Amino acid sequence: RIGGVLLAGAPGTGKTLLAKAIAAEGGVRMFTCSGTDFYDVYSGVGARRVR
Amino acid sequence: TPAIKWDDINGIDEVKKEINEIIEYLRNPALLRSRGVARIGGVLLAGAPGTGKTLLAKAIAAEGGVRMFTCSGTDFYDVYSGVGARRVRETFDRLRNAAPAILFIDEFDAMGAARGAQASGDESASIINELLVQMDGFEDNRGIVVLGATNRPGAIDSALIRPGRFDRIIYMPL
Amino acid sequence: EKKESQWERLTSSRAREFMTKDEKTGKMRDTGVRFEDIAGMEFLVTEMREIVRMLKGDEAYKRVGAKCPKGIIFQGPPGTGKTYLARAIAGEAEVPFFSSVGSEFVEMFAGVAAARVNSLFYNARKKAPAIIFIDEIDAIGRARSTLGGDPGSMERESALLAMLVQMDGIANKTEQVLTIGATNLAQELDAALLRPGRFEVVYEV
Amino acid sequence: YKKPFKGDYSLAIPTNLYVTDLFLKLPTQSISNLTNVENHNLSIKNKIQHFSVLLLKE
Amino acid sequence: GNKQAKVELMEVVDFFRTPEKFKASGARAPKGVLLVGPPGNGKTLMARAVAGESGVAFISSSAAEFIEMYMGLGAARVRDLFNTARSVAPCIIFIDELDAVGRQRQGGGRSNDERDNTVNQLLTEMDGFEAEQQGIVVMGATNRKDVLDAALTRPGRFDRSIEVRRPDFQGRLEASLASLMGGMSGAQIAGVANTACFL
Amino acid sequence: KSLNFALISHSKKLKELNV
Amino acid sequence: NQFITYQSWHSHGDLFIDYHPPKTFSHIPALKYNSILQQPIGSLVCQIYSGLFNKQISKNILLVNPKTTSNNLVDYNVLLIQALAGETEMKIITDNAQRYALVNRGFAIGIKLLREVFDAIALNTPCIFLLEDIHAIGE
Amino acid sequence: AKLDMITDLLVIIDSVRSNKGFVVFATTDIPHVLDPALRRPGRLDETI
Amino acid sequence: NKAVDPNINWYEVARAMAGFTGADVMGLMARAARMAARQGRHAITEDDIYAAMENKTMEATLEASTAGDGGGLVGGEGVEGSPDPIPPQLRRAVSVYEAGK
Amino acid sequence: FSTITQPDTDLIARQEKGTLFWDIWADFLVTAADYYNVNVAALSTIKAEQNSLIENISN
């Protein structure tokens, strides 16, 4: 597998639109999240959320 | 339910009319509606505590010939999560039974505040949600006035200020 | 019969008792200091002697309805002798004395704080008339600093709440229990201890 | 300046700031002719911007 | 050596084990020693020597170890340490790095509540309703003279302001050479000696 | 406070107490 | 009195859906003299009365009432939105964005609360969300 | 004060367009301090 | 997808939209439909899109020149510093200004 | 709907006995308050509940 892909450019130019178009072409549904969401007030929780 | 007259109070002159509004609301509604006051529930008493307070509210009840209930917001929420919601629920049900009444809550900043230096989790949210729904409506609080004593009205959340909760506010001067 | 006993051991009777016989040997838990070794604060000594003699059942001022202050706060800079003054009031009052510290009412388990202050006050109420001394009440009576979700902040708030309730209790009729709190950071106290019914006397030392 | 989407609200365009000052502020006031003052009739700004119990607390 | 602190340490061990002349003169007891000075001049070694001269036990502890994320744990540890001290009857209590805990109890931040509790517990264990008295001396070690609490530096808890500094000419003689290595502490002196031996 | 009939009733009441 | 303040559809936070407020556009005579208000407010009212607002795409509208009112003597933004909901006889859910201005231990609990609120209001359609003081969190 | 809440408020406001049936009214008295990203299309752009 | 007039030179319009992202374009077409409704049409024209760009610029300036008192810049309001029928001298001055520019 | 979504026998019987216990004979708070209460720790096994109960019987 090619694997992880970095999407870069202007702020919010084509990121979610491109991801949704890719998912629609692949016939799958996104599971979108953020790196800010992978955090909590305690330690050892964000890694568990990543897993 | 606890057990110097109103004319024995002389430290206030102008706000005596605003308190007289509460006397006339408890003694004769639909006269208060003819003066534009559709409803009056929560009334906040602010200023320096120790002056008036219980004396004021007792005089209010003694001039309105009406059941008087005393509670402290300190005792409503101590350590128990979710229990305080049922506490204020049962309080308001008892009040709706004995219903002309002047429930007086003391130390309103125990429950009338928002998140801050206390652990604001499920406990304060549940007790303030129950206070909001019991003060708001649906369960008709006919003849029920809640006099809340506070020292920092700006510390009272934007949930109990919204028109229809505790909109009326009385400042006790010196 | 074991978990309740363990909870009682953890959250009960965490103080010291004075001017009573020892529970194991019968020795009188005395301090040895009276109102003669604390010379230098004579007006406050006269005030504390008046408080003690009024607590002992004086009828000289009950005709006018005078009421003995419920709580008494000793504030001032460190080293002025508030502690030695409290030992002198212990040795002179001859009443069951309950000595504790504000820092002794702190634990990591939720409930302990309130249970300890409740139990202390309850023992005082049963052994009436009694004098309670909590050195450095600012560890308990500290005001809320506008922000924070600390477990210590929870414990401090709960210990406050319980204390405020036990304090307003004594007022009602009740058993004529005098509580004394000595501290140096009195300005770091909350907005409720100063109120009437509560620690209504703040003696500046 | 006055572009459709590029110069919308940006505080980097000085003319937008002049427009806000002109339409929301009370004149401008010029430089004083006094001594021991900074530019106007004012001193230097603060560098860093921000019972007995109540008596001691205050 | 050890600046002029050795006379004070002699006084400490003398009224610890054999008062005699102090009881004849009417002096009761010092009840605290606050060693002020930079680290590297044997601040803990002097207290170890005082305990060895007085024939009492020594337990190594510092104020940083009392800083625990469990609320009340540091105050409980301080209380337990003083209870074992009273059980031992007598000993010497050493508290190291007092500048990390006992500093300016004014409040602020969610890291100083337990710290203020520990300072208040230390205050009520050093003084308070008389529960220890006796021949018990508590020694603390700080690098600054007065940065601690006013009650902690009050002369009823730490009533001896014994100060040590870098060794002088005779101190460096004891531990032509002192002209060359004059102006640094004994730890750096020992490091210089070890480097010279390594060369 | 706004312009409603409660204000007119209050004005009439104040006139009656001052008549 | 058909004006009721029931809890959310999920119920047992507490979204506090407000049903049929007792307000009309006669409460605002300042609406008929505002050229800006007429098109969006009339479009919303006619979409509601036609039923199309049920099946329309959700939209966000910013309201600006400049800070000149003394204290909180009847805010005209909430007055206008309550008049819209009362004239249309439509559920209105109000909230303040100050209550979601929470950052603790490097984490924003108010963001999770606002996301939960925005996902919960998706179920009580058709309705009018009224998020006041968006400047408190959108600084 | 960690102001990472803006980049999540942007996603929260942008998620309303996928929804249907309701209308959101965000009120403010100070639109100048509002984030210009929040004024971008797909977000709180329409202003009355 | 939606209803627009087919006689639109989308290149010339996109030339006028130099410096835009794609969601910006989307929202500009939405407010162009709003301007079409304002002029009284269901279809969007290039005139409607240009009016949408002008409306965005004017709204941006108006939310910098009314934030607390304002004055003059927003005429036609029916309140204090805003006569509703923009006077003939004022509209003559505005026309002369814009014609000179 | 209003008739079928009404309390049944269990809920109605738990509404009168519950009222009688926690609402009618919970007025003994004024009695035990004028004689002696501590409350709070009057939960669990404080053993003052027994003394208060026998004092209520003795009157």
DSSP state of I82: B
**Closest-CA residue to G61 (of G9, G138, G134):** G134
Most I CBs within 10 Å, among D5, D9, D16, D21, to test the I interface: D5
Candidates G5, G72, G96; nearest CB to B136 = G5
Candidates A11, A12, A36; nearest CB to H8 = A36
Residue I3's contacts (CB-CB under 8 Å, 6 or more residues apart) are I42, I43, I44
CB B86 within 8 A of CB B48: no
- State whether residue D14 is helix, strand or coil: helix
Structure determination method: cryo-EM
Cβ of F8: how many Cβ atoms within 10 Å? 10
CB H23 within 8 A of CB G53: yes
Cβ of A17: how many Cβ atoms within 10 Å? 13
What residues pair up with A3 in beta bridges, in sequence order?
none
Q: How many residues does chain D have?
A: 58
Closest-CA distance of chain J to residue B92, Å: 12
- State whether residue G61 is helix, strand or coil: strand
Q: Can you tell me the distance from the alpha carbon of A28 to that of A36, in angstroms, rounded to the nearest whole number? A: 24
Q: Can you tell me the distance from the alpha carbon of G119 to that of G128, in angstroms, rounded to the nearest whole number? A: 14
What does residue B171 show for φ and ψ, rounded to 5 degrees? -100, 125
Residue F18's contacts (CB-CB under 8 Å, 6 or more residues apart) are none
Cβ of residue G53 closer than 8 Å to a chain H Cβ? yes
CB C73 within 8 A of CB C105: no
Q: Can you tell me the distance from the alpha carbon of I53 to that of I29, in angstroms, rounded to the nearest whole number? A: 10
In the structure, do chain C and chain I come into contact, i.e. share 3 or more CB pairs under 8 Å?
no
For residue J15, give the amino acid letter.
Q
Cβ of residue C95 closer than 8 Å to a chain J Cβ? no
Closest-CA distance of chain C to residue B56, Å: 16
What sections of chain J are H helices per DSSP? 9-19, 28-35, 48-58
- Stretch 1-48 of chain H: residues touching chain I, C-beta under 8 Å: 30-32, 40-42, 45-47
Cβ of E82: how many Cβ atoms within 10 Å? 20
The answer to whether the CB atoms of D51 and C202 lie below 8 A apart is yes
- State whether residue G8 is helix, strand or coil: coil
Q: Can you tell me the distance from the alpha carbon of J5 to that of I18, in angstroms, rounded to the nearest whole number? A: 64
Nearest 5°: the CA angle C41, C44, C47 is 150
Rg of chain F over Cα atoms, rounded to whole angstroms, equals 9
**Closest-CA residue to D8 (of I101, I67, H35, H12):** H35
DSSP state of J23: I
Contacts 24+ apart (CB under 8 A), C7-10: C10/C107, C10/C109, C10/C112
Maximal CA-CA distance, chain C: 53
Q: Can you tell me the distance from the alpha carbon of C97 to that of D51, in angstroms, rounded to the nearest whole number? A: 28
Helix I22-39 / helix G35-50 crossing angle, nearest 10 deg? 90
Closest-CA distance of chain I to residue D29, Å: 19
According to DSSP, the β-strands at C16-18 and C97-101 are antiparallel
Q: Can you tell me the distance from the alpha carbon of G36 to that of G64, in angstroms, rounded to the nearest whole number? A: 12
